[PDB]
Paper text:
Found in both prokaryotes and eukaryotes, aldehyde dehydrogenases (ALDH) (EC 1.2.1.3) constitute a large family of NAD(P)-dependent enzymes with molecular weights of 50–60 kDa. ALDHTt contains an unusually extended C-terminal arm forming novel interactions with the N-terminus in the quaternary structure which interacts closely with the substrate entry tunnel. The ALDHTt monomer is composed of the three domains common to all ALDHs: (i) The NAD(P)+ binding domain (1–125 + 148–261) comprising a Rossman fold, (ii) the catalytic domain (267–458) and (iii) the oligomerization domain (126–147 + 494–501). However, the presence in ALDHTt of an unusual extended arm that wrap the facing monomer through H-bonds and salt bridges shows for the first time how the tetramer is not merely a dimer-of-dimers carrying out their functions independent of each other, but that the interaction of the N- and C-termini in CS-related monomers may regulate active site access in NCS-related molecules.
However, ALDHTt mutants could only be crystalized in a closed and compact conformation. The ALDHTt508 structure is “open” as the “Crook” of the tail has been removed, but there is still no movement in the anchor loop to an open position. It is worthy to note that the electron density maps were of a reduced quality in the C-terminal region of the truncated mutants compared to the native or the full length recombinant proteins, highlighting the role of the extended C-terminal tail in stabilizing the overall structure. The similarity in tail orientation and active site regulatory loops between ALDHTt and its deletion mutant structures even without intermolecular interactions between the end of the tail and N-terminal interactions hints that active site access is regulated by additional domain interactions. Attempts to assess enzymatic activities at the higher temperature of 85 °C were not successful as both mutants rapidly lost their function compared to ALDHTt530 where it was still active up to 4 min, consistent with the Tm of ALDHTt530 of 84 °C. Taken together, the relative stability of the recombinant enzymes was in the order ALDHTt530 > ALDHTt515 ≈ ALDHTt508.
Residue numbers in the entry:
A (entry chain A), D (entry chain A): 4 to 507
B (entry chain B), C (entry chain B): 4 to 508
The structure:
Amino acid sequence: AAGKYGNTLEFGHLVGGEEVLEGPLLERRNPSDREDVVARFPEADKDLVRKAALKAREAFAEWSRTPAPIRGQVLFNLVKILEREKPTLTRLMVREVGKTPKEAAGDVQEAIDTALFFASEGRRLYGQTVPSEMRDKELFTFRRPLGVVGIITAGNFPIAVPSWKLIPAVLTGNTVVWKPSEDAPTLSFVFAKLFEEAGLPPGVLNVVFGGGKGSTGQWMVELMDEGLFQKFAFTGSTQVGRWIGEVAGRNLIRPTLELGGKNPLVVMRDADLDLAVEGAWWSAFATGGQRCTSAGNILVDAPIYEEFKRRFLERVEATLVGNPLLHPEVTYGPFINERFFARWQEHYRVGEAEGARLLFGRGRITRENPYPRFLGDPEAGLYGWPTVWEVRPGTRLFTEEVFGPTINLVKVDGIEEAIAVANSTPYGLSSAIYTNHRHWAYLFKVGIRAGMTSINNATVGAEAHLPFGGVKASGNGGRESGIWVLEEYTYWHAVNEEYSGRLQ
Amino acid sequence: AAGKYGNTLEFGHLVGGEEVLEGPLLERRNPSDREDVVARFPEADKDLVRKAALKAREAFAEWSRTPAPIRGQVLFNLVKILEREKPTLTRLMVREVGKTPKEAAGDVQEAIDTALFFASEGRRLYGQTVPSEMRDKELFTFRRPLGVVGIITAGNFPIAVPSWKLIPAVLTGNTVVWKPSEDAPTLSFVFAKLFEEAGLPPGVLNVVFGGGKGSTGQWMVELMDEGLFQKFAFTGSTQVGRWIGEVAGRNLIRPTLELGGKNPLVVMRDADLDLAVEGAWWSAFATGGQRCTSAGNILVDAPIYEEFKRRFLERVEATLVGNPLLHPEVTYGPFINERFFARWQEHYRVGEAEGARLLFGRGRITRENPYPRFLGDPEAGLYGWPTVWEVRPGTRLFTEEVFGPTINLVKVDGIEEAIAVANSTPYGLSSAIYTNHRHWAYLFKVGIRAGMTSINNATVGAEAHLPFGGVKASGNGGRESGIWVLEEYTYWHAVNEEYSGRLQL
Amino acid sequence: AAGKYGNTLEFGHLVGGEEVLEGPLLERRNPSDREDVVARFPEADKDLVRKAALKAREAFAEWSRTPAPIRGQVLFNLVKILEREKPTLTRLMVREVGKTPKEAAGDVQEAIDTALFFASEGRRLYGQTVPSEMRDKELFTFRRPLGVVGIITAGNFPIAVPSWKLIPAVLTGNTVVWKPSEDAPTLSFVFAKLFEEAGLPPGVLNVVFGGGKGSTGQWMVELMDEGLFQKFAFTGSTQVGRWIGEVAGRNLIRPTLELGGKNPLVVMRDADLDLAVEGAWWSAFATGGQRCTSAGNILVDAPIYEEFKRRFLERVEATLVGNPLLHPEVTYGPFINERFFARWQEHYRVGEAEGARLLFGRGRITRENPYPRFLGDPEAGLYGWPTVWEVRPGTRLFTEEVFGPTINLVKVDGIEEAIAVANSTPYGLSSAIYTNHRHWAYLFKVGIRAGMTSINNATVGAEAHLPFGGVKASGNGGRESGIWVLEEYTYWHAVNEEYSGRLQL
Amino acid sequence: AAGKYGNTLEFGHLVGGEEVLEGPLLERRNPSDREDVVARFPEADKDLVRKAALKAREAFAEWSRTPAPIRGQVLFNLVKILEREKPTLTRLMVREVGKTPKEAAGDVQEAIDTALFFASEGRRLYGQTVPSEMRDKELFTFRRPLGVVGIITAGNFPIAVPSWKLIPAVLTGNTVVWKPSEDAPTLSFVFAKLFEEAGLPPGVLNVVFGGGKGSTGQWMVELMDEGLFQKFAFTGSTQVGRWIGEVAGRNLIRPTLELGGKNPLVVMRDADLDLAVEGAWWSAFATGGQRCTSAGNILVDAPIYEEFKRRFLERVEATLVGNPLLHPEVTYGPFINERFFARWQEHYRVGEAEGARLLFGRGRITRENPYPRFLGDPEAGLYGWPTVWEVRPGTRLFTEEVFGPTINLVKVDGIEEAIAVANSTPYGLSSAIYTNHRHWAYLFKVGIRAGMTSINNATVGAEAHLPFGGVKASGNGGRESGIWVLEEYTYWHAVNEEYSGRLQ
Ligand SMILES: [Cl-]
Ligand SMILES: [Cl-]
Ligand SMILES: [Cl-]
Ligand SMILES: [Cl-]
Ligand SMILES: [Cl-]
Ligand SMILES: [Cl-]
Ligand SMILES: [Cl-]
Ligand SMILES: [Cl-]
């Protein structure tokens, strides 16, 4: 078929390098305009996943024992292919998940950067030579591939965040089974095909499509109990993370777990207001607030509270919203999926119930409830009014993660107290402070309990060559970019060579 | 009291730096001679563990914010105090767990080495400065303490293996709750007091004594569900490890898990037989086969099978066994506890049942079933005949870990097949090959699935400044000594500083 | 003009991104066939070098303060452009320096690999965060660009070896003045233009052509005394290196110095002869023996001496020699320049004089003195008979580097003595041993005084992502590839931040 | 003999572990009181140095091939012995070089810290395992000892700064010839004996006493031309450094060169004045201004110039000066040697000549020119009035290093200009800025051309586990503490092992 803004594509799983149309058909509709159908694709039953894992096990023998620098050459080709395809993938990603074209070119770019980074790590992966305490004896360490990796990914960063996992996994000589978000199946099929074209041998990467709970994603976790995975990486909700953590736990796997957060952004009295407003604004409404790292609470220092709040609302009022395929100028578009739209709609009622003051936002944008800076037709999909609250700490709006274009303001007095309030959340992913006093940035830097912190910078837009990850309910201690991710996809082999003829 | 070979000591838990007699008294008997009672000490009820965790939470505020190089000064004092106490700790460790005096001085030494290593890491703990892609912007990383660490340790290495966990934990600014093996409570009490004398502030280290299943150790794991631990380290059985793994799992903790193994030792046709026999022998019978890393199977290359086997048994015949307090010359002594003795006694009947050929070993040493090279009285404790089997791969003697002085022989042909058989085991901790062909050592080096490998060297005797740890059922991927353990007791804080006063994205 | 095998090209210096015809014209002839003229190009007078250094000083302001990851983007484009141009650079390099097409594609490849390596180091260059001993105080380190780098390169690896210097220099934010070998000026001009196309801002790279002694290269060193260079890298003879060393010395510069060697290759009795012969053979005659790392002495273990020698000469007999443009199948071609041909011709007379036994080789290949496996016309250039000697240690053939297709045999007895003889040379660059006894490779590994060592592998063919460099007369301790070269083109800035608002000391 | 405040000690060189009284007698007098004679000791003629180098060459065979962790055990014993001796060495160092007892206990402490640091590096010295691009092939690197190291040291940090060189040298398996400052020969003899007691085998450390120019130090450099040294480290003047650099240069040695500096300290308008005054004050007058890192110029931001200058002079007026053996409370004491006293006396006349304004200081303290806060008798030795100038940039007081208790003030306007003025000096060792604006500290941090920089902290008191060293005329690129010094005393051996039977 042709769809409304492009072709409807039908395709199967990729197992040992073949297409496999095996299972009930699902379909992904353009979230910006649900009349456009983007793709049609099977639900992998659990036995197909079992097969995919075992093609991966067969492929690992040859791939793992392929020279690491030659594995790098595959990634180098991928860098080139990704570069070529960057305009295509940008178009497709606006169609399939409703990111703005600026943000979507950015997504693709991070995969390009990731691929370049690891092409080169083919000739690094440094281990150690160590001095023995004994004469006539040498000591070594060596990073070794774990085996078959199972990977589950969300759809809000559908090329970038998969690449953080897929690329270092195959570079260190592992083999992969990948279950991508039913929100972005076409991009995943493509990205798997780009990898094929780049030279990845068949079976090294296998892709199985489907849903999460009661679907493929769950079957996929359950297979850790049959020992088909030597490693597992997941991006998603803390509820699901804890479960996957437990399953990996009893099967002696360290899993990688990016689990979202409630990201504090502090604005001290001595801050540059315009800059801090631009950063709160962008932290809140980038990707329509559907980022692990989107800001949950702006903590504004009491002296500047009123002035900040007036300027922030001015800025929020200006947010454009709309079909980013038809209106590239727009700040954000639709909800990626139905599930986030629903949780976000409920957040209004929890707010009113616990007594938050709603400063701006009239829930879902529709004909009967139109939004002044909307562009296009708000009924073609699920779009949300920008939303702003004032909230007491301790409350549920304050502590619980809510994907969607919502942000809270909170009045704080101390730096003392700003730090205490910033920490009053089960999460600990991302954080930010806007200030000019060296001492104030120092105290927050070391007083916050987060895995990432920004000074005079948004909670979003971490650079791709720094360790990405959260502490507390935001993850289990692993990190995803740079040299730090090598701990995730390898283990330490320790070797001692005796050249004397003596026991010692 | 006075005991038979020293004092019987009574003592409590150490919580926020005070002694606490709270719970039913247990007792640790001298395993070499169970008439000697070494200690009486309480079983921490779960609420006292809860309190210990919360003293640790109170103490973490000031310890974590104590300069890392000053935390190193504490460890440097500990190195000196440990040095002073090395002869007394050696005596006490032969009394309390029945290690030979040579092996027990060695145990103490690894704590000394560990403490020196980390005294100095107080002025390292390096993180990174990183270039931004943006002008007027700097990037950093910082290693940060996790919080309160819960630690459970076995008793077979009662000073060394605890120190691998305790020392890097407090050095990186964490606070600790420690539950030591009911097999070695006096050494743990001491070691906690040496730490105190070295300058560790009270509450930074808390010690709660007791048992494992249905006791303190279990209560201690269960508390991860109340979020009292931000990290957990365990040495023990894979059965228990899997459970601890699961609990830590749902609480988003990476735990540290040394879970023992079935350690393959390969002897290729071109090996030096006398040297390979000394290494199989020492791998098997060091600590009476009660090490995570003790050898489980000798894989002998078919061409030298018969010659090796004859010489190995000659060497095993020579093993001395006895009360290492009265006979220091002895190779190994008693079982640490009655649990290991029991599992090892059953292994004879599993052996007979699946049809292993028993080449040597008459089960428990007693007066009625004496051992030619025994010294002392074998009824005063649980002592085991050195034991040798031939076994087919696939069997339970071949695949299952059995603490005790038992080893299997297996005939192999290729290097091909040596590697395939070495890997036919759920475990993946330690390994060894005896060979002189460079290509053969290379193929084993890269063909084995283990986290430690020895060439012309035993499966035991890892050096303390190399990463200790197993793959497969032997652990979950963490590592314990050297710079590698810093990943366990810290997390990565990533900081980005904008000085350019504009949003650039 | 049109030449005989391509165009004759005329071109100038590149200074702040402009072409500059300033100075007396030199010419580079096709060494394989000197009727073919490859290029005409100026000799930079010392004042033009002075200007090039000062364009580099002007450009450093904005390049150094260009985000390192963006500097990497330039290199990533260069990788792509180099890939596109790999067949043309291969052709041109066979024309301009007489490398065989296989070896010349390899040369280009190492630049490609180098550029990819460093494209990625744009997002690394890691420094350190370090714990203070004081409360409320943080410590950092930062790698910083040195400034303007002066670079002099040989012509035998005219794209690879320049890239080891050029690329890490500009990546770490330095600016460059480059004086390339008058043996390979067209490739250098090209490579500088590829860099331009890749996005290198003008003035960041400046190229000044000319000669060495009494020419541009000398003027270029002399300018360290006017402080126009904050760093200097050189590939060449130890004679020249010592001088450059001294000049950099008094100007407080650590310079980078690859200074060639006399590379010992040992063949123990237990070696695989065919493999060790292939490795001695390729070590000797790769690039016609015109590599820093080409083998100088084969040390053969007395038991296999005669057998090895017979097989080696059989293999040497088989060497093909010829115009690699017309006969790609050929092992090596002409001398790069007339200087090397001259020194190598004299080596025959030094040999006769000190009493070496000449086993094979009749000096220069000519029509009147033809070589059985020559292809083409040997008078069109300077070509050399493969040459083999037996020599006593202590002699000048044994100790002195001789670019050209010459190799010595030496009889040795121990591993003992193999190592002692291997070390009896002023140089210490590369080394190799062929053996199967693990202990013998270990003793050589730790007994040799060299900065690179091969086990059952040639003295040539270092991998590009390992540190390249020599000890003794082969260099001053710096290293060229991988992470190790970052020490050369940066300095360590150490920063300490006090937030505690009090003097504490 | 007994001297006036302790024993006069006579002793020889230490060569292959024996005492050697061979040469004309020199003597070191107590600089605080020159009637007290501290020591009597020979001048090593050049042939004795030649012998010392060759004992070191013989000893290297055994020491280098001694397990690195066992070499660490020697240092661990040294830590303990140094701890025991810390009160003795502190007394002796106040007697022999006239440091205050606080500063001298500090000196000894840095050696203790250095020794602990490197005791532990016995089990580190990490090298690399690297992946080959070829199948059946492994790559390694290994740090290797250079050989015999020649070491020349100044006397102003007579235990600390020698330990930065001596300890990492012997730990990495090198052997040493050491020529210590004729200003501190007793401490060096002692420290060499403590090393002996700690377990250092004889010949691994050799000590040869004497002078510099036309004496042992020079003979010692000249021996690089006979190839007796594989490495050379020097602390001293830039003139001498350049020479040693050249000699090492032609002999293909990378030498280590700490060469002093003219250390800028900037005080921005937003600074904390009391803190910045305490830091200028301590930067200037610690060790009587006889530190490589002592401050040369205070750059005061125009808005606060007058206020700062008044408070600084108040603080300087308070400086106590005197015989630190008899008056521990004193800030600084005598000149270490006659040479610095002389250069510092000349600096007054260069100042007047180029027109600097002298704000405070009457040259040498004597009976006829007494100093209000002097304690003791100023004629017993060479003591200097604290000295303060205002100076134009470009002048010689501004650009040239002057050991002694002198400091300049300079008015600056920009941060722009503060950085330009801070850099207008041939040196580039140490630096500092006092400020609270994050942007101001950032611009200085990255605009200065120095190898060490302090924010709201003195130019002195670098921590011992950070890389110590200067750029420009302050050194040649090497660094001295921490992991960074390992580049100085080792070289990189690169090994490739082929296990196939193939050429590739
Ligand atoms: Cl999903
Ligand atoms: Cl979800
Ligand atoms: Cl949904
Ligand atoms: Cl409110
Ligand atoms: Cl001196
Ligand atoms: Cl001087
Ligand atoms: Cl003098
Ligand atoms: Cl003035």
